[PDB]
Amino acid sequence: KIIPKPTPTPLSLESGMKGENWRKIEPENIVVITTKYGDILIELNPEFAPGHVARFQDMVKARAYNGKEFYRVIDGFVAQGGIDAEDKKWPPLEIEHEQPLLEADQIQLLDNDDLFAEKVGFLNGFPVGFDAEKKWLLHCPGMLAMARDSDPNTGGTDFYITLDAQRYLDRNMTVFGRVISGMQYVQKLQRGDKNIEGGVIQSPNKGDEMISVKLASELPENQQPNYEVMRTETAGFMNSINSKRVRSDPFFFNTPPQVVDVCDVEVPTELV
Amino acid sequence: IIPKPTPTPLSLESGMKGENWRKIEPENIVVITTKYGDILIELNPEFAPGHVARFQDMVKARAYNGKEFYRVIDGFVAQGGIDAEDKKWPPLEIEHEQPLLEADQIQLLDNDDLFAEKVGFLNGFPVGFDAEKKWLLHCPGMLAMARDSDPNTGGTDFYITLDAQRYLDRNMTVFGRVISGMQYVQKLQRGDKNIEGGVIQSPNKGDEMISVKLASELPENQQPNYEVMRTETAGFMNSINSKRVRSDPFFFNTPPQVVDVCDVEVPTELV
Ligand SMILES: [Mg+2]
């Protein structure tokens, strides 16, 4: 029995210690992956993939990922990890590769070209593509998505983090999170070889361990890492875009083009 | 200021792989030994002969041995070098671009690019060009020379791109590409971009370049022999079209027939 996708919920816009131009990340949507290198922190996105977020939370709370491995890692591509097995406790999910575009959705359009989509921009701090009917998350670097088999509804336990942009995967995979801290540790993960079992790390060697995985909500509040994200629908966010397009430093005797790759735009995200 | 010399064409000596491949000359292979493993880089005197010669001189003088990747910003660049003033190594004239030659056999990428009107490949390197000039692209895993605001101030300290930094194109001397050990570059100790521009702070130190050598400094049978596919040949198109045309039923939404010039992998093999 494949688990059907539930209805999406827009991300909370609760004001934080910062101005009304920022939103609090809810603690249940913060995942802390502890590796020997340090902690990888991820913001989950139930606005695009509520079914996968719920599943991920369940597995994390159930300690299902503790001691598991990033068993498949290809440099410059993705770092993939999970239970590396089928478990009757965790049946497959319906794919959540895109969502209906809603009238309430406040997308900040990026007013320069993109190679893969006619329209790209930002929605609640996440990079997105959209058309008249649909919206989807972009496979920018540091995005969390669910691995699957050829049939779309086969994902549900094993995930990957993008090491570089993989835009060709857009609208074919369930993206349900983004890295907000510790991306450097993802980059330290033991690599496999793409020409050997598709990057699966081979015996006698094993991928680096997920020593523990928790939700911030599992910690007592006074130990919870408090994160806030700039609201990308505000005028203040444009600077984060115009700083990369308009480069006036005398360093440049050849003025750079007024263009920025949507996946290079950094959304202000701060620990509070 | 050391003036820039005339560019020199890359060797097209055929290898074990055949006439559609070229051997990389050992003098144009740099081996950076880290605690993680070896980073190998192919130098490009076709674009930056002056910087290549300088870099070769410093490597042979063992000037980089025991030095650090002292400035590293995740997703940006890993910068290393002597991190000091040295009278032995005066600044070089910038080599940020070269005249486009009719003899240049550029393989044009026939899809859009965000930063340049024409992009493609020249002797296994990503390039941009117009009517008059050609330049190397700041794709990931490219080696370039750090400098100050004045163009002719580079010459000792270099950086390796961790991700594409195309906005730097035509403003910096790019003079090499990583051909092996990119994963080790990604393991390098990081600094913090909001603290001294990513310079790693005491008591911590950047990871050490334990040794830096040219392959040519080794005896022939210990030299790593690398060959690169000639990008002007028809065989190279697959490396492009494999990523543009994805017909696998895995994709129920067929990807657009487009590839970022910096995502194209030029066949490069150890033999
Ligand atoms: Mg990139």
Author numbering:
A (entry chain E): 8 to 279
B (entry chain A): 9 to 279
What does the primary publication say about this deposited structure?
Hirschia baltica contains two cytosolic and five periplasmic canonical single-domain PPIases, but also two large, homologous cyclophilins with 293 and 300 residues, which we term AquaCyp293 and AquaCyp300, respectively. Our data reveal a unique two-domain architecture of AquaCyp proteins, in which the catalytically active cyclophilin domain maintains extensive contacts with a composite domain formed by terminal extensions and internal insertion elements. The crystal structures of AquaCyp293 and AquaCyp300 demonstrate that AquaCyps fold into two domains, a classical cyclophilin-type PPIase domain and the NIC domain with a novel mixed alpha-helical/beta-strand structure. Both AquaCyp proteins are stabilized by a conserved inter-domain disulfide bond.
However, AquaCyp300 elutes in SEC-MALS as a mixture of monomers (60%) and dimers (40%) when injected at a protein concentration of 1 mg/ml. AquaCyp300 is active as a PPIase as well, but it differs significantly from AquaCyp293 and human Cyp18. A moderate PPIase activity was observed only for the Leu-Pro containing peptide, pointing to pronounced substrate specificity for hydrophobic residues preceding proline. In contrast to AquaCyp293, AquaCyp300 differs from hCyp18 and EcCypB at six out of nine active site positions. The residues His54, Gln111, His126, which contribute to the PPIase activity of hCyp18 as well, are substituted by Tyr, Asp, Met, respectively, providing a plausible explanation for the low PPIase activity and high substrate specificity of AquaCyp300. In AquaCyp300, the first eight residues are not resolved in the crystal structure, presumably because they are mobile. In the AquaCyp300 crystal structure the six monomers are indeed arranged into three dimers. In particular, an extended hairpin structure enriched in hydrophobic residues (including three phenylalanines Phe258-Phe260) at the C-terminal extension interlocks the two monomers. To our knowledge AquaCyp300 is the first reported dimeric cyclophilin.
